[PDB]
Ligand binder design. Sequence first.
Ligand SMILES: COc1ccc(/C(C)=N/OCCC(=O)N2CCOCC2)cc1OC1CCCC1
Ligand SMILES: COc1ccc(/C(C)=N/OCCC(=O)N2CCOCC2)cc1OC1CCCC1
Ligand SMILES: [Mg+2]
Ligand SMILES: [Mg+2]
Ligand SMILES: [Mg+2]
Ligand SMILES: [Mg+2]
Ligand SMILES: [Mg+2]
Ligand SMILES: [Mg+2]
Ligand SMILES: [Mg+2]
Ligand SMILES: [Mg+2]
Ligand SMILES: [Zn+2]
Ligand SMILES: [Zn+2]
Lengths: 332, 327
Amino acid sequence: PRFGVKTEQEDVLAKELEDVNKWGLHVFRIAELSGNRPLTVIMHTIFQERDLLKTFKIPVDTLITYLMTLEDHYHADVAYHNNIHAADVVQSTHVLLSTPALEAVFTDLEILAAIFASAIHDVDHPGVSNQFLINTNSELALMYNDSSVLENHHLAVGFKLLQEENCDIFQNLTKKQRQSLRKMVIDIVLATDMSKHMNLLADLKTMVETKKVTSSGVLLLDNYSDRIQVLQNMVHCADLSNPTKPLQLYRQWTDRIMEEFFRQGDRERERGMEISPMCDKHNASVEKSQVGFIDYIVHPLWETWADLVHPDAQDILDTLEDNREWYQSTIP
Amino acid sequence: QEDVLAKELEDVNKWGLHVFRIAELSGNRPLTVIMHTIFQERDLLKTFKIPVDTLITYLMTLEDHYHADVAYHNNIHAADVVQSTHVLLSTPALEAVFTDLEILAAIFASAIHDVDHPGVSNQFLINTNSELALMYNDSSVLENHHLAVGFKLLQEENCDIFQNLTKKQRQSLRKMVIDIVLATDMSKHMNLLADLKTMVETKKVTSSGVLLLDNYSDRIQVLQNMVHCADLSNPTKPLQLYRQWTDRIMEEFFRQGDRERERGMEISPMCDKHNASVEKSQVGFIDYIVHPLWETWADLVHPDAQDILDTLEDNREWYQSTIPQAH
Ligand SMILES: COc1ccc(/C(C)=N/OCCC(=O)N2CCOCC2)cc1OC1CCCC1
Ligand SMILES: COc1ccc(/C(C)=N/OCCC(=O)N2CCOCC2)cc1OC1CCCC1
Ligand SMILES: [Mg+2]
Ligand SMILES: [Mg+2]
Ligand SMILES: [Mg+2]
Ligand SMILES: [Mg+2]
Ligand SMILES: [Mg+2]
Ligand SMILES: [Mg+2]
Ligand SMILES: [Mg+2]
Ligand SMILES: [Mg+2]
Ligand SMILES: [Zn+2]
Ligand SMILES: [Zn+2]
């Protein structure tokens, strides 16, 4: 099939996929047009556009088989942490990687690692937080000793699915390419644990203070530490990009995260536990909480990214400020 | 003979307990016997309302999950690390420093710290694409697994020894045990040592000469290094014990090297039965790992550990004495 899956009209899906290189791709429409296969469709498109199948000798049927299997392990009944979110983070990383300040900085293997990490970074998410898994003595928290419980699990699942029949998209990488990619993917997905956000941002501010740049604004990264730190922060920014998107996308993302949070709070309430912050549907201030989220997490991060790639992210920052105003203006 | 076993257990508060003798006399139950003795000695059953039958049931199932056919990383090693931690906890420089819950965490951590060890290193598990390294993303693979198994066994029938701890105590113990067992990963050794050296530099002592450890970070750092020292204590023991430990670790390493050889892999250092010297390997282990750590522990608690450091230095001089050297 043209776009990796069957669709009732590829012509509409093709028109939408022309925005795969743009911030604010219509990812919910892509999900509908692809029969709920946005992750497979978007990954297929990106791998073809970046010529990654030829570079890494990835058979296209192997790519599609792995992507379908991976997409199937995102839960259909989780409102936010599902295959649409995975597709969104993939596509947002794909746009961030093309930013002019990063031209020719990353190798094809680093690009592959960032995209693959984005695709697997929330797989098999149960719709509850690490702290909920710890507080309820879950098997997952027992397995992972309360540390980056979900993020360790997403990695283990995403790598394990490579072992299924006709799913090993890395079969033609060399042994050291495989080792390098595995290390980068682990480093990137572990950095999506929000318990690491403050340290990650503090370190990113330090890199920005000492950035080295060519005449035309292209960053000069010196070693693995520099490269992986930019990739970690890139995928973290993509994971935290909802409020920087066109407002209709952001509004839907907010509706979905609140649905998932409220379902967690209901589980907490039913077990007599303290309800987690922003998970009480009976005592919620959705609009206020979005403004607080932007003020304390999203704008500090994106203003630092925008500094790193100046001026590449100026419109993203401007959209963030407009979207902050939307939620401020709709506080009851 | 239960008579001789009680005599051997008389030395449970001394460095150099004959743990191999206790293993034989107890019917291969050194971990159960030594944990029970130490829990009685420290009055831990009464402090934490641990039913004695619950303790024995948990300890027997924990001991069952150390592998008999692993020559070094088995229940005797667990029992040795427990008893060594038990001695280090009573060092005069740390008198009345640690709470009973901190003491319980350090001893429990020692007891579980190598459970279900397969007899191969983290690097081997990573390099062979093992399921354990896949589960744990190549990071403290075995130590994460030891923790998960040791805690999981608390769920077995009549095995929850922490059942009468408060919720808060249980959460604190769990955190402390995780922090301690993860610090036994040798890839963290240089960072642990660099930080311990700096803690020694700036250490604070009471009048009485006892260390002052104000917050959790300083307290847990001392417990981490203290169990790491116990894990690395074999060369500080009397030569007749140290020789037995050296035999066991080389058997285990050589079996890993045989698997690497069968697989066409580069044999890990010190794992080639054909091209390795015991003496050079032990002198190197002492010079580059064990003595740098123990001289720093000895600095922290000076002069409490001088006899331990004296034995270590004697054993190093002993094992280097048959290696030809320029004079
Ligand atoms: C559109 O609104 C939101 C979108 C996403 C999120 C996040 C970050 N949710 O975190 C849950 C998963 C999580 O913990 N992660 C994954 C991302 O990076 C950090 C680690 C939060 C949102 O708004 C929240 C804050 C105000 C009340 C609802
Ligand atoms: C009774 O003997 C031993 C007990 C325990 C261990 C441990 C914890 N080994 O961890 C491997 C790292 C290691 O040993 N290194 C790496 C850096 O250079 C020095 C050597 C090692 C023991 O002796 C080993 C070394 C001598 C031959 C067998
Ligand atoms: Mg190129
Ligand atoms: Mg996540
Ligand atoms: Mg091939
Ligand atoms: Mg640099
Ligand atoms: Mg009220
Ligand atoms: Mg160990
Ligand atoms: Mg001998
Ligand atoms: Mg020295
Ligand atoms: Zn995510
Ligand atoms: Zn050990």
